């Protein structure tokens, strides 16, 4: 441009500015992360009897937010307990590798529960503890969904009404067990050996806390958009003495390959 | 060496529920009773707090007791509603009305029979009872009066056993009752006579801790219950797990109680860090000792500088060498000799458990028989005299058949214990 | 934190408040419904609105303002207006009968029956604010409500909230244009209150704004709307330091001590530049030095009081936009070298510089143009004795044989109050002359 | 049929609200090396070598000449403590089961 | 000599009381191998 | 906490500000180069015609 | 060994946090606190400015101090701002209001208790600290008033420990505050009686270097603080790194402080060059020494030509030969003997540090106790006395609590030290 003043010095300043810089890399990394997370995954269908199966990819859907359980691999925390990867509920169209999960059996049953039959070895039964694992493609280490006790420094990411649920590689642990139950707490006393059907609306409990998984439909903006807060805790319209009546839609879930909640 | 616990009142019910929360977390016990620990260390001494069934289910040795039925109707809806025995829930039709007289003489009496029945069940179910723990609040009617009645009957039945008492001392800064001084005065002398050594909490001290140490805004009573439950779990750490320097409740009482009446202790936990400062702080034994002897970490609304430590106990937890944990407290004694007492050389007693709490490399629970414990009793006595001079709120107590002279007897016991603490604080060799 | 409570006394105060509040909503991105859109691009919400807006659990933002006026027309029309949902239905107090341009009526008869409720609303505003910085009272002492009720309110604030900072943006009578015959009476009666219970008073005469907008914006007939837009722009430039981060952030008490040399000396002029129309906004290079020179120009001032007749005692320059701490320094140095403006001897530095990275916003349908940078003045100078010398001369002219004094007497005011205010204004002349006198 | 307040203080649309506030100016700060660097800024080198380390060495194994000791671009090869520290503190990221390892250490 | 490392290698996966290990196993992967088909409630190896 | 939340907001707003300034400089340079190339090819086409 | 730093006011806080970026760059520390240095030269002395946590993160020994929550939020505005410990962030609800009295007596004094608490905790954390460091500006209220208030208790508690303070003294050319002379006059005497050595920083000279020595078109405060960060890194480079000729804080003090009252240093940096002409400047010790002693390069706005160097110090950094690092000092002394006092032969303390800042071949920091500090002190004291004669702006201070004649005492402590520098400016043997 005009050579008034210290034009040569400004030009050298600018040129060495770009030289030292040598934004675009950050945008490319962001796009690569989005592509890696949203790489579609094939979830297994319902075969023969409509019973949920183990060792198969599946989509976990909430009945209130209509979203699916998802985990964002970045934005973590390194606590003494281990790695802390934030999980939430997101509105997804296809079964992306980010928002898909697989159920695997756990070690210790109820010690009151019945021995599961040989033919139903691969079928998850009501109240049978299981780990929720991210599929292989998301990350070469396994991530396990687990909650923990509500403490002074433990709560939901923004709100504090529910507990802190998260994905972490600290699997094969007591905290990482999750058990399955039907929509009615009253009816979850006699169906404990029966297989769980896929098509029915269903509910997830965390064994250590004895609290059901839920999502408050509270939006927090994560790097993938606007996620719904996810936590553990029984939510009821009336704060009665015992609660446990008509379960709020926060705590209801579903594990169907085909079909979606409303 | 089983320790069998009881929870009296709704305060006691909540504090014991989250105490069992912490204990089940440490021992790997699921809310349904299944043991799901990682190593055999948890299972080695799981019998102190739980007993196994025919199917292997672990049941806590806990007795839930309260005149108000709603508290135990609701605790069944908690995480461990199904963990406790169904027959260990002992409820009355109506609450004590925050009335010590009817909680200890009229409504407690008709229910203390069943409470003693269940307590004897749990006591005789074990091969060697180590202590009767009881968590309650002294500012209420059912927690204080009926709890003290339970303590009296337990002391009569088992004179040579430890009487663990976790009593929530009420404070006027967080006062939510008006018969607070009455109940505190009527329960404290029963605690003095019928408990080998007490363990006393303040809601306001816990609030100060959560304000200026944890840096947290507005949770419910769950935070205070979590801190007190951590202390309750840590006091028996050496009993429940191996360590370089083991200890038990009787050893703690021997090392902390120089005279039978002087058995009130203030507690402190370490380490405590804010939500976003756990990894900004280096967990070391020096930091743990500093937090132990820091006032803001004291869970008791008594200033340690006003008094002197008769004795102190440090139940440390975690892998660490013994010299930097005992010489450190020798050094703090050397630097704060004015805060200690001369005629007891090395008021400090140290115990080491080798299993730290989950998520912490090392920790410690502090216990102190400081003479500053008399501040709360002075305040309670002043409030009691102010209320009693005008005979205020006394017809409720006198209508339950409790005598007039008992209030003066409680006043005399308060003055006697305060005089003992003061005359041992200012005593010279 | 840094909450500031806005009070609007009288019709002029209420309309100035309306202008500054639409400006604040525009700056903070608040619709008239009272809601703020979620900034999805960042993902976490601003806290800059806290100083002027209080959050509700439903996410609605309530302004921290009290519209106090003794007659219901303006406040009812606001209740009917666009910002009805935004403004709190309370804190919008309406009287039943106007003060009728009577300081005695606004301070002695109608003032008492509404000052209790006004203080109740002020307390409900203050106890909400956990970090209350101070009060900003917009009023015109020329009228009756703004003079009398304003003086009473200042009395109660001074006696109840201790030494909390007070910023009285006062519209004083102009040299020639005035809309009342008893306006100098009201002004001279209210000078006592604005001298005793006003921490910093800001001059807002009308002719200066009128001619500034006429010659700078090239607009033939702008009105109260436009002058209130300028007043809101000035107050927003003054208060933006604590709302938006800058190179040098100055709070109310931060520049109060730098502004006020003596407790009796707190009446300050103001100016703003560039106040430029859109047509010639993109032809001139509005540099920091250029805008500073425009501010220091006696014509380019929001107060009609020539500084060359006095001496500057303390100037505070609030820059907004892409200014740099060295461009402001260079402008300051060049203007110190320049001699047409005089600074008092006992104040060598005499300059305060606050810098904010937030360029001024533009009100849609307004006259101010989009400019990359701007700067406002809070100048305490001895030249302000001129306006008082005009107003007290007018008061003496009408008081030689007691014109319009039976109205004040019949409202419970003693005849000696006028005389008392007269020697109060005489002392406010004498102290300014003394501080302006060379050592 | 209308008032001055209605005519001037009109309703505002979302786009108008967004456009009223202008994006604030961003202060420009020179990078550290840009303000204090000499030579080729594109290839920044390091001179973290010790004079004692360079001058005093096993002469039979390796020798550094005088001017090389005085000036040479590089970093010292003594890194045992740093290697130990990195080992202690061990494209999707890796999240090892350090939590389970810590739990096993605790128990 | 890494005492903690060799402890994790051997002691953590060691079994001291196989009776207890079978009776109340936690998250243990060692010592769970018991008698193969010896314990059937039917009392006979024959089908039910 | 309020302090950490406000500080983190400052983090992201400053980062966004820096990116905006950076690609504003890039778009200025790109517009300059595009204008240069467009007029060079326009002059060539004019001479050819 | 270690040096614990404290930052006061907006200027001091921003300068110190911008310096912590330089320190973390030198020691190979990311904002997350993890260590990435490629050699043990950056790790063997990392404890000087850092302390390790449980997870290995190195937290700076920085005590941030101000009265503005916004200043606490924007002090960590740099990329390395997350590195600071959250608990050290201490601030008041209301700012100083540009008032020395408010920052020193009432509103900043109620927080100096917490300042001393955290500072004493950090000092006791290390083995034994070599000295304290402070970064502040006398132009403001909270940086000057409460900074002096803090160094008061620092000197009282640690009488025999070094007290370094980097004080920014604004100039009337660059002045942006009217109570600036008051604050400077009230703080200078505290620096005199409280600090063993204190260099002065002037924004006028800083800008002069940024305009016509760096030849930059638009440097803001961020680039302005770079010179200060570089020099206050080179002051302790010898502490944190080896060298042919070591030095430390007392090394510099004993050689730069001939008399106890003479510890105000004007000081600068080298090498400096325009970004248009780096590749033409031949980096050598002769060029370094040439650019050390010229008036423009030094970052104090009073040329050395009107004064006589009482003494000077040259902290070179980088592998350079010891012959010409010091014969250059000899040569400049012999060709400018008129600029050096005769009664102190060889006025130059030359020291060599082994490791220069990374990305820099060689560097040097110049710290001189020349007598033209009286120039800044006169140019501020004349303003102070002119504005004090007419009682201007004194009502804020008097209402805040300070006595009227304390300002007369401060002016006396200005004038006596000004005369102290005068009587050695033209001293004869
Ligand atoms: N700058 C400015 N001045 C105004 C505005 N409205 C009124 N004024 C002036 O303020 C002076 C005093 O106000 P008043 O007209 O008496 O109205 P008031 O303040 O409510 O007092 P009352 O008449 O008793 O109600 C008038 O003479 C007007 O010239 C306005 O919107 N902007
Ligand atoms: N820490 C804690 N304190 C409690 C809880 N519930 C009540 N309190 C305290 O107990 C006191 C009231 O005693 P109260 O519960 O009525 O005694 P009770 O009726 O005999 O059980 C109050 O001062 C509370 O601070 C709780 O869940 N946790
Ligand atoms: N070099 C430099 N000077 C600064 C900076 N910030 C403020 N200052 C100077 O500090 C003076 C004002 O100090 P102030 O911020 O009021 O100090 P405080 O009140 O203690 O925070 C101004 O004259 C500036 O020149 C900075 O980042 N760098
Ligand atoms: Mg009116």
**Which sign does the torsion angle of CA G220, G226, G228, G229 carry?**
positive
Taking contacts as CB-CB distances below 8 angstroms, the residues of chain B near G53 are 279-282
In order, the DSSP letters of G51-88 are EE-TTS-EEE-EEEE-S-HHHHHHHTTSTTGGGS-GGG
Tell me if E8 and D107 make a contact (CB, 8 A cut-off).
no
Q: Are B165 and B188 in contact (CB under 8 A)?
A: no
Secondary structure element (H or E) that encloses residue B22, with its range: helix B9-27
Q: Which ligand is nearest to the CA of B166?
A: 2
Tell me, in angstroms, the distance from the centre of ligand 3 to residue G138's CA: 9
Strand partners, B62: B5
Measured CA to CA, the distance from residue B167 to residue A120 in angstroms comes to 52
Considering only CB atoms, C364 lies closest to which of D16, D24, D25, namely D16
Residue C417: closest CA among C393, C395, C439: C395
Touching subunits for chain C (3+ Cβ pairs under 8 A):
A, D, F, G
Secondary structure element (H or E) that encloses residue B169, with its range: strand B162-169
**Which sign does the torsion angle of CA G176, G178, G184, G186 carry?**
negative
Considering only CB atoms, B223 lies closest to which of A81, A152, A177, namely A152
Considering only CB atoms, B73 lies closest to which of A108, A174, A241, namely A241
Nearest CA to ligand 3 atom 14: G140
Measured CA to CA, the distance from residue A246 to residue A225 in angstroms comes to 32
Nearest CA to ligand 1 atom 29: C179
First to last CA, chain D: 83
* Cβ of residue E18 closer than 8 Å to a chain A Cβ: no
Measured CA to CA, the distance from residue G84 to residue G101 in angstroms comes to 29
The preferred substitution site among C10, C13, C205, C391 for testing ligand 1, maximizing ligand atoms within 8 Å of CB, is C10
Measured CA to CA, the distance from residue B251 to residue G192 in angstroms comes to 59
Across chain A, which distance is largest between two alpha carbons, in Å? Answer: 90
Measured CA to CA, the distance from residue G86 to residue G76 in angstroms comes to 11
Secondary structure element (H or E) that encloses residue F22, with its range: helix F2-48
From C207, C254, C417, C429, the catalytic residue? C254
- Residues 63-102, chain D: which have Cβ within 8 Å of E? 101
Contacts of A31 (CB under 8 A, 6+ apart): none
Contacts of C283 (CB under 8 A, 6+ apart): none
Tell me if C46 and F9 make a contact (CB, 8 A cut-off).
yes
Give the dihedral of Cα atoms F37, F39, F41, F42; nearest 10 deg: 160
Resolution (A): 2.9
If you measure CA to CA, which chain F residue comes closest to D26? F17
Tell me if G59 and B276 make a contact (CB, 8 A cut-off).
no
Considering only CB atoms, C329 lies closest to which of G74, G174, G395, namely G174
Please work out whether the CB of residue C143 comes within 6 Å of at least one atom of ligand 1.
yes
E strand intervals along C142-258: 165-170, 200-203
Tell me if D50 and G281 make a contact (CB, 8 A cut-off).
no
Can you read off the two tokens belonging to residue A217?
Answer: 């439909």
Q: Which residue has the tokens 């739980």?
A: B50
Please work out whether the CB of residue C411 comes within 6 Å of at least one atom of ligand 1.
no
* Cβ of residue E12 closer than 8 Å to a chain D Cβ: yes
* Cβ of residue E38 closer than 8 Å to a chain A Cβ: no
The two beta strands, G264-270 and G197-201, are: parallel
Contacts of A90 (CB under 8 A, 6+ apart): A67, A68, A70, A99, A224, A225, A227, A228
Contacts of G36 (CB under 8 A, 6+ apart): G28, G29, G30
Taking contacts as CB-CB distances below 8 angstroms, the residues of chain B near F1 are 215, 275-276
* Cβ of residue G398 closer than 8 Å to a chain C Cβ: no
Nearest CA to ligand 1 atom 24: C144
- For B373, B393, C304, F48, G69, the CA distances from C188, given in Å and listed in that order, are 66, 63, 18, 83, 41
Tell me, in angstroms, the distance from the centre of ligand 4 to residue C207's CA: 20
Q: Are B141 and B183 in contact (CB under 8 A)?
A: yes
Inter-chain contacts counted by CB atoms under 8 A, chains B and E: 26
Can you read off the two tokens belonging to residue A163?
Answer: 């507990």
Residue B114: closest CA among B66, B60, B49, B61: B66
Can you read off the two tokens belonging to residue C424?
Answer: 């109060």
- For A242, B340, C73, G138, the CA distances from G190, given in Å and listed in that order, are 66, 39, 61, 11
Measured CA to CA, the distance from residue C364 to residue D91 in angstroms comes to 48
Q: Which of D84, D100, D104 to mutate to test the interface with E (most CBs of E within 10 A)?
A: D104
Burial class (CB in 10 A: 0-12, 13-18, 19+), D90: exposed
Q: What angle do CA A56, A57, A59 make, to 5 degrees?
A: 130
Secondary structure element (H or E) that encloses residue G369, with its range: strand G363-370
Q: Are G365 and G318 in contact (CB under 8 A)?
A: no
Measured CA to CA, the distance from residue B120 to residue B126 in angstroms comes to 10
Strand order in the sheet with G264-270: G62-65, G3-8, G131-137, G162-168, G197-201, G264-270, G363-370, G309-317, G348-353
Tell me if G77 and F6 make a contact (CB, 8 A cut-off).
no
In order, the DSSP letters of C22-42 are HHHHHHHT--TTSB----TTT
B217 CB neighbour count, 10 Å cutoff? 9
First to last CA, chain B: 39
Nearest CA to ligand 2 atom 17: B140
Instruction: Give how far F31 is from chain C: nearest CA, Å.
Output: 20
Q: Are C115 and C197 in contact (CB under 8 A)?
A: no
Q: Are C286 and C324 in contact (CB under 8 A)?
A: no
Q: Indicate the angle between helix axes C150-160 and C183-196, nearest 10 degrees.
A: 10
Taking contacts as CB-CB distances below 8 angstroms, the residues of chain F near C45 are 9
C404 CB neighbour count, 10 Å cutoff? 15
Tell me, in angstroms, the distance from the centre of ligand 4 to residue C138's CA: 14
| Long-range contact set of residues B191-194: C-beta below 8 Å, sequence gap at least 24 | B191/B138, B191/B148, B191/B151, B191/B165, B191/B167, B192/B261, B192/B263, B192/B413, B192/B417, B194/B148, B194/B151, B194/B152, B194/B154, B194/B155, B194/B163
User: What is the experimental method?
Assistant: cryo-EM
Measured CA to CA, the distance from residue D33 to residue G356 in angstroms comes to 13
Taking contacts as CB-CB distances below 8 angstroms, the residues of chain C near A219 are 38
Tell me if F17 and D24 make a contact (CB, 8 A cut-off).
yes
Strand partners, B73: none
If you measure CA to CA, which chain A residue comes closest to D32? A20
Residue D85: closest CA among G25, G240, G43: G43
Can you read off the two tokens belonging to residue A220?
Answer: 């927090």
Taking contacts as CB-CB distances below 8 angstroms, the residues of chain C near F8 are 44
In order, the DSSP letters of G86-102 are GGG-B--SS--TT-HHI
The preferred substitution site among B6, B9, B10 for testing ligand 2, maximizing ligand atoms within 8 Å of CB, is B10
Secondary structure element (H or E) that encloses residue A231, with its range: strand A225-232
A137 CB neighbour count, 10 Å cutoff? 17
Secondary structure element (H or E) that encloses residue G5, with its range: strand G3-8
Measured CA to CA, the distance from residue F9 to residue B263 in angstroms comes to 52
Burial class (CB in 10 A: 0-12, 13-18, 19+), E48: exposed
DSSP secondary structure code for residue G265 in this structure: E
Catalytic annotation present for C254: yes
HSE-CB at G107 with a 13 A cutoff on CA atoms is: 20
Peptide bond into B271 cis (omega under 30): yes
Secondary structure element (H or E) that encloses residue G21, with its range: helix G9-26
Measured CA to CA, the distance from residue B379 to residue B188 in angstroms comes to 13
Helices assigned H by DSSP within B128-179: 147-157
Can you read off the two tokens belonging to residue C331?
Answer: 């402008």
Can you read off the two tokens belonging to residue D104?
Answer: 């096993």
Residue G144: closest CA among G226, G200, G73: G200
HSE-CB at B257 with a 13 A cutoff on CA atoms is: 19
Q: Are G134 and G151 in contact (CB under 8 A)?
A: yes
Considering only CB atoms, B28 lies closest to which of E17, E21, E26, namely E26
In ligand 1, which atom is closest to the CA atom of C142? 12
E strand intervals along A54-201: 57-58, 61-62, 68-79, 82-90, 101-105, 130-134, 144-147, 165-168, 178-182
Measured CA to CA, the distance from residue G316 to residue G237 in angstroms comes to 9
Q: Are G176 and G147 in contact (CB under 8 A)?
A: no
Touching subunits for chain B (3+ Cβ pairs under 8 A):
A, D, E, F, G
Strand partners, B350: B314
How many helices and strands, by DSSP H and E, does chain B display?
A: 16, 12
Measured CA to CA, the distance from residue B397 to residue B97 in angstroms comes to 11
Measured CA to CA, the distance from residue G293 to residue G346 in angstroms comes to 15
Q: What angle do CA B284, B287, B290 make, to 5 degrees?
A: 150
Q: What angle do CA C79, C83, C85 make, to 5 degrees?
A: 80
Tell me if D92 and A170 make a contact (CB, 8 A cut-off).
no
Q: Alpha-carbon Rg of chain C, whole angstroms? A: 21
Q: Are C144 and C186 in contact (CB under 8 A)?
A: yes
Phi and psi angles of residue B428, each rounded to the nearest 5 degrees, phi first = -120, 150
- The percent helix, strand, coil of chain A (3-state, each to 5) is 15, 30, 55
The preferred substitution site among C248, C328, C353 for testing ligand 3, maximizing ligand atoms within 8 Å of CB, is C248
Tell me, in angstroms, the distance from the centre of ligand 3 to residue G80's CA: 21
3-class DSSP assignment, residue G199: strand
If you measure CA to CA, which chain B residue comes closest to F5? B276
Instruction: Give how far G226 is from chain C: nearest CA, Å.
Output: 16
G189 CB neighbour count, 10 Å cutoff? 19
Q: What angle do CA G110, G111, G114 make, to 5 degrees?
A: 125
- For B14, B407, C346, G377, G409, the CA distances from G404, given in Å and listed in that order, are 61, 61, 17, 21, 10
D38 CB neighbour count, 10 Å cutoff? 18
Instruction: Give how far C291 is from chain A: nearest CA, Å.
Output: 22
F29 CB neighbour count, 10 Å cutoff? 11
3-class DSSP assignment, residue C378: strand
3-class DSSP assignment, residue B364: strand
Touching subunits for chain F (3+ Cβ pairs under 8 A):
A, B, C, D, G
Inter-chain contacts counted by CB atoms under 8 A, chains C and D: 65
Q: Are G188 and G384 in contact (CB under 8 A)?
A: no
Contacts of A207 (CB under 8 A, 6+ apart): A129, A174, A177, A178, A179, B30, B31, B32, B36
Tell me if A152 and B210 make a contact (CB, 8 A cut-off).
yes
**Which sign does the torsion angle of CA A111, A114, A116, A117 carry?**
positive
E strand intervals along C90-208: 134-139, 165-170, 200-203
In order, the DSSP letters of G272-291 are ---TTSGGGS---HHHHHHH
Phi and psi angles of residue B203, each rounded to the nearest 5 degrees, phi first = -60, -40
If you measure CA to CA, which chain F residue comes closest to G86? F4
HSE-CB at B130 with a 13 A cutoff on CA atoms is: 17
């Amino acid at each position: 441009k005009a050579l008034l003043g210290n034009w040569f010095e400004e030009e050298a300043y600018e040129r060495d500015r770009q030289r030292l810089m040598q934004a675009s890399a950050e945008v490319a990394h962001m796009m690569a992360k989005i592509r890696h997370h949203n790489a579609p995954h094939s979830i297994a269908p319902i075969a023969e009897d409509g019973y949920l199966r183990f060792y198969v990819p599946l989509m976990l859907q909430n009945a209130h937010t209509c979203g699916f359980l998802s985990v964002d691999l970045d934005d973590r925390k390194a606590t003494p307990t281990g790695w802390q990867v934030e999980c939430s509920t997101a509105p997804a169209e296809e079964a992306t590798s980010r928002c898909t999960v697989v159920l695997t059996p756990a070690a210790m049953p109820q010690t009151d529960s019945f021995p599961i039959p040989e033919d139903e070895a691969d079928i998850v039964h009501y109240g049978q503890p299981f780990y929720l694992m991210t599929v292989r493609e998301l990350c070469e280490d396994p991530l396990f969904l687990m909650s923990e006790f509500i403490t002074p420094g433990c709560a939901s990411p923004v709100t504090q009404k529910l507990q802190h649920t998260y994905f972490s590689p600290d699997g094969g642990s007591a905290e990482a067990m999750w058990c399955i139950e039907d929509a009615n707490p009253a009816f979850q006393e006699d169906m404990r050996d029966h297989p769980v059907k896929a098509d029915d609306v269903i509910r997830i409990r965390h064994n250590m806390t004895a609290a059901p998984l839920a999502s408050l439909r509270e939006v927090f903006y994560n790097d993938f958009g606007a996620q719904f807060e996810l936590g553990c805790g029984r939510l009821t319209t009336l704060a009665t003495k015992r609660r446990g009546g008509p379960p709020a839609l926060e705590n209801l879930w579903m594990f169907i390959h085909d079909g979606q909640g409303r | 060496r089983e320790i069998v616990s009881c929870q009296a009142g709704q305060c006691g019910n909540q504090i014991g529920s989250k105490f069992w929360e912490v204990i089940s977390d440490e021992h790997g016990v699921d809310p349904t009773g299944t043991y799901q620990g990682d190593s055999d260390l948890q299972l080695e001494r799981i019998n102190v707090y739980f007993d196994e069934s025919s199917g292997g289910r672990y049941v806590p040795r806990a007795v839930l007791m309260d005149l108000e039925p709603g508290t135990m109707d609701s605790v069944r809806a908690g995480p461990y509603g199904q963990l406790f025995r169904p027959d260990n829930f002992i409820f009355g039709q109506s609450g004590a009305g925050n009335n010590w007289a009817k909680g200890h003489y009229t409504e407690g009496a008709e229910l203390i029979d069943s409470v003693l029945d269940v307590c004897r069940k749990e006591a005789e179910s074990c091969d060697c009872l180590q202590g009767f723990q009881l968590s309650h609040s002294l500012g209420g009617g059912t927690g204080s009066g009926m709890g003290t009645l339970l303590i009296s009957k337990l002391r009569e039945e088992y004179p040579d056993r430890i009487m663990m008492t976790f009593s929530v001392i009420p404070s006027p800064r967080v006062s939510d009752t008006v018969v607070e001084p009455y109940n505190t005065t009527l329960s404290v002398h029963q605690l003095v006579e019928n408990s080998d050594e007490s363990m006393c909490i303040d809601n306001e001290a816990l609030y100060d801790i959560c304000f200026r140490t944890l840096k947290l805004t507005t949770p419910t009573f769950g935070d205070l219950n979590h801190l007190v439950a951590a202390v309750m779990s840590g006091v028996t750490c050496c009993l429940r797990f191996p360590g370089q320097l083991n200890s038990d409740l009787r050893k703690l009482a021997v090392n902390l109680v120089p005279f039978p009446r002087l058995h009130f202790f203030m507690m402190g936990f370490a380490p405590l860090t804010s939500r976003g400062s756990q990894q900004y702080r280096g967990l070391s034994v020096a930091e743990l000792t500093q937090q132990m002897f820091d006032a803001k970490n004291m869970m008791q609304a008594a200033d340690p500088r006003h008094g002197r430590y008769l004795t102190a106990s440090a139940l440390f937890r975690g892998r660490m060498s013994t010299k930097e944990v005992d010489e450190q407290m020798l050094n703090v004694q050397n630097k704060n000799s004015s805060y200690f007492i001369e005629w007891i050389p090395n008021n400090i007693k140290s115990s080491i458990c080798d299993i730290p709490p989950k998520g912490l490399k090392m920790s410690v629970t502090f216990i102190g028989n400081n003479t500053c414990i008399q501040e709360m009793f002075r305040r309670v006595g002043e409030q009691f005299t102010g209320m009693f001079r005008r005979k205020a709120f006394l017809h409720w107590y006198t209508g339950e058949g409790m005598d007039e002279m008992e209030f003066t007897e409680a006043e005399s016991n308060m003055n006697d214990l305060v005089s003992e603490y003061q005359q041992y604080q200012d005593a010279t060799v | 934190m840094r909450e500031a409570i806005c009070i609007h006394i009288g019709q002029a105060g209420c309309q100035v408040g309306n202008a500054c509040w639409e400006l604040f909503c525009l700056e903070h991105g608040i619709q008239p419904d009272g809601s703020m859109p979620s900034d999805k691009c960042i993902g976490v919400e601003d806290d800059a609105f806290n100083t002027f807006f209080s959050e509700t659990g439903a996410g609605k933002h309530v302004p921290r303002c009290l519209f106090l006026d003794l007659e219901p027309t303006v406040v009812d029309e606001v209740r009917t207006g666009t910002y009805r949902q935004l403004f709190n239905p309370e804190q919008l107090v309406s009287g039943k009968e106007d003060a009728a341009n009577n300081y005695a009526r606004g301070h002695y008869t109608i003032g008492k029956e509404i000052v209790d409720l006004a203080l109740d609303r002020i307390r409900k505003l203050a106890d909400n604010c956990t970090g209350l910085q101070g009060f900003m009272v917009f009023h015109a002492v020329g009228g009756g409500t703004g003079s009398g009720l304003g003086a009473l309110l200042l009395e109660r604030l001074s006696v109840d909230y201790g030494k909390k900072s007070k910023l009285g943006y006062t519209v004083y009578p102009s040299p020639q244009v005035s809309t009342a015959v008893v306006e100098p009476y009201n002004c001279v009666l209210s000078t006592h209150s604005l001298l005793e219970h006003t921490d910093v008073a800001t001059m807002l005469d009308n002719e200066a704004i009128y001619d500034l907008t006429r010659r700078s914006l090239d607009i033939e007939r702008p009105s109260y709307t436009n002058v209130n837009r300028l007043i809101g722009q000035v107050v927003s430039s003054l208060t933006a330091s604590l709302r938006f981060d800058g190179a040098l952030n100055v709070d109310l008490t931060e520049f109060q001590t730098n502004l006020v040399p003596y407790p009796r000396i707190h009446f300050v002029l103001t100016s703003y530049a560039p106040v430029v129309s859109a047509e010639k906004a993109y032809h001139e290079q509005l540099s920091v030095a250029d805008i500073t020179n425009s501010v220091f120009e006696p014509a380019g001032m929001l107060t009609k009081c020539d500084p060359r007749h006095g001496k500057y005692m303390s100037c505070c320059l609030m820059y907004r936009g892409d200014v740099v701490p060295k461009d402001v320094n260079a402008a300051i140095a060049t203007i110190k070298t320049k001699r047409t403006i005089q600074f008092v001897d006992w104040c060598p530095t005499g300059f305060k510089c606050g810098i904010n990275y937030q360029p001024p916003t533009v009100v849609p349908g307004g006259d101010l143009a989009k400019v990359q940078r701007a700067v406002c003045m809070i100048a305490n100078s001895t030249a302000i004795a001129e306006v008082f010398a005009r107003i007290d001369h007018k008061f003496d002219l009408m008081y030689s044989k007691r014109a319009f004094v039976h109205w004040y007497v019949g409202e419970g005011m003693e005849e000696g109050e006028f005389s008392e205010a007269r020697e109060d204004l005489a002392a406010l002349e004498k102290d300014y002359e003394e501080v302006g006198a060379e050592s | 049929p209308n008032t001055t307040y209605s005519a001037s203080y009109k309703s505002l649309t979302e786009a108008q609200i967004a456009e009223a506030k202008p994006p604030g100016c961003f202060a420009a700060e020179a990078p550290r090396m840009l303000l204090f660097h000499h030579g080729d800024i594109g290839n920044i080198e390091t001179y973290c070598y010790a004079t004692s380390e360079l001058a005093h060495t096993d002469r039979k194994k390796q020798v550094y000449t005088n001017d090389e000791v005085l000036d040479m671009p590089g970093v010292s090869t003594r890194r045992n403590k740093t290697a130990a520290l990195q080992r202690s503190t061990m494209a999707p990221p890796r999240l090892l089961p350090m939590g389970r390892v810590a739990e096993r250490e605790r128990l | 000599f890494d005492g903690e490392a060799t402890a994790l290698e051997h002691i953590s996966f060691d079994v001291s009381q196989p009776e207890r290990r079978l009776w109340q196993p936690g998250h243990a992967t060692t010592g769970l191998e018991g008698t193969g088909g010896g314990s059937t409630y039917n009392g006979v190896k024959d089908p039910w | 906490s309020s302090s950490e939340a406000r500080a983190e907001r400052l983090r992201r707003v400053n980062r966004y500000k820096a990116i905006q300034a950076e690609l504003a400089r890039q778009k200025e340079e790109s517009d300059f180069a595009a204008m240069r190339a467009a007029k060079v090819k326009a002059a060539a086409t004019d001479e050819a015609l």
